[PDB]
Point group: D3
Chain length 151, copies 6
């Protein structure tokens, strides 16, 4: 279906430390997106390096890897129609200072390096990120569509 689209979201160590996990989950739940995977973990260097592989050649890659592996991360997978692009709109933009009020980064962030949450940029990136962070057993298979949310 088109309503079975999935995105990977990570509440970064700064979002976890600031106690924003519930606030964030509650925003995606109110939207109508279904939580199909959820876990708290301290990421390994390998998970971090494979996750941010598009920034591997840039000077700040080291710091990104160090910071995401510096403390607990809440990894989640949400399912819904256009969940990839929608989840991103809900987060805001790279710079939290330029992110609109009402968005996660707009409401809670001030620094690019401490930008609370990260989401998949595309359906291809999502499917790769989901497989990396989660095992098939850790993901829901039975997802009954809400007739209140979908026509």
């Amino acid at each position: 279906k088109v309503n079975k689209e999935r995105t990977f979201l990570a509440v970064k160590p700064d979002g976890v430390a600031r106690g924003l996990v519930g606030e964030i989950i509650a925003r995606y739940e109110k939207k109508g997106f279904v939580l199909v995977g959820l876990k708290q973990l301290v990421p390994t260097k390998d998970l971090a390096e494979s996750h941010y592989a598009e920034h591997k050649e840039r000077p700040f890659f080291g710091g990104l890897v160090s910071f995401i592996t510096s403390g607990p991360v809440v990894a989640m997978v949400f399912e819904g129609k256009g969940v990839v692009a929608s989840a991103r709109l809900m987060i805001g933009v790279t710079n939290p200072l330029a992110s609109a009020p009402g968005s996660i980064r707009g409401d809670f962030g001030v620094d690019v390096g401490r930008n609370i949450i990260g989401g998949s940029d595309s359906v291809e990136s999502a499917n790769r990120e989901i497989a990396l962070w989660f095992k098939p057993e850790e993901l829901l298979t039975e997802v009954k569509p809400n007739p209140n949310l979908y026509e």
Copy 2:
């Protein structure tokens, strides 16, 4: 006045079923718009066709008419300066996935067919919609202006 402008708003069956009525009323109350009419009802095919008349030649007309009659609707009328255009901005856009975080559809909707709330598109549409859903007795006549909201 100007500040006596009125708009018609309908919390659709999906918005009532999902328990979003108070959430929605609170947003317009916080804004400074005065509730001049309020009721819960199951709309008739008669009322629905008349309400959705601007789309009577479109292929989706029947579907809009079927859905708005499928369960209880919370019908309301708000009064304030630029309430028609403002109420619409507060709702978001046709596609809830494209609606900005901070708006009703932006925060709670995923599908065009399940887009929670509908509002008048113009002052002319509002005056027609208000007369169609409400009787003069069901509307407030005495509206004292709040000196904290109006200069």
Copy 3:
């Protein structure tokens, strides 16, 4: 059955004027109680005296009648298991200053005469109050059983 119990609730002129209608409705909706009746109206002296009949010989009767008729009131009917005793608990006690934080009066009221909301004191009072404020046509007959709320 027992989950089909109904209570009458009135957001008094002070609760309406202060813009607390959406806040209050959202509280009962969150709880799992179903809205089966809703309307805004300016009560007549006849409706006000009939409503406050149990206190018709008390010195404060006139004052209660004068205030409930002084502006718009939001009249509602909620359905659920033990809704009568549960709505009262959610409201708090007669004196809002003695009402616990978390209740409507505890969170928003300071005066007995400006105590925002009133609810039915018993199933008997509820059935009488509902018939007095609402016509059978104004009340839902089809109430969808929620399997997440009720075992």
Copy 4:
């Protein structure tokens, strides 16, 4: 330490289905309790029976084991001073209708069978429940004491 006390909390299938996971996590985070374990899973009949082992001879045991395995559950472990007793106070009482406004069950529940969340009744039950639902690797070891929350 005393501040290193841990409790096991489960958002039951009804709490997950109603989209209350984030609302719940936010409440414990706002309090100052640290999340040390988190996961979503559909529990097996075995894990449910071992979890509800204290009631294995009671007539309602079967019903509790059937319901907790009927859909996804969000399993969590929180750390803090008096977290076992405090989480329970935050949840409310067995009957959500008797639970005080401000508590989780007092704000969102109407039925004993659909009472959203369950928490450990003691430190001994917590240590057993934590070991039963989580592997030592799934739980945090490094827990930074907040000098704003602890003297």
Copy 5:
């Protein structure tokens, strides 16, 4: 009248450092209590000792003085009927773990030493505390009574 009663409230350094100032102020404003004095300051040892004078011979006195001077404090004065006792009820009890959900300490605190906010225990203590923290010029004199909050 008796609606002119005043209380002194202090958001302690832990309260301020955790970013609970606006949350706390919103609660008293929603209640109907009028803010008649407000300031942020780092208290001097002299002001701290004078404030905590009733406990000057207790073993914990030193610790209370050390902590209230360790960082910024948001000092405020609220006016309204029974504001002294009501403000205390809103705060909760000495131990935040024993404080009811819905109270400031019940919702946000875990430790007696980090109990976010302090309020006057009596009208006599309030009048003394107000004079100690505020100059007559720093306090409002013109307080128009809200007819929506007082009969």
Copy 6:
């Protein structure tokens, strides 16, 4: 250096009277901006004219001066990276009706004359406004950077 930027914000008499002080302070605190100055006062014509000096020859100058002196104002100073531009984004635009939902004016305002809060338009205007409303003693000097908010 860059994270030490400061802005001046004034919750205008309309914002104070509508009890919005707590809501506003919370928004800036959630964001990660540090409150370095805070006070409630009734501004003098001298302070008002100096504050609104950039518009001293515009026809609306008198109206702005009259209104900001008509009741209590909550003056505050926030510190953070890009706080001047970010605080304006959080306020919205001049016309609250055109302000996006999620912004303060977008969420609570209807009139240009009653637009709840004013903020510095530039770093130069901020430094001037801060020195005008606050004495150096009234401002924090020791501001430890939060490692959860800054890289």
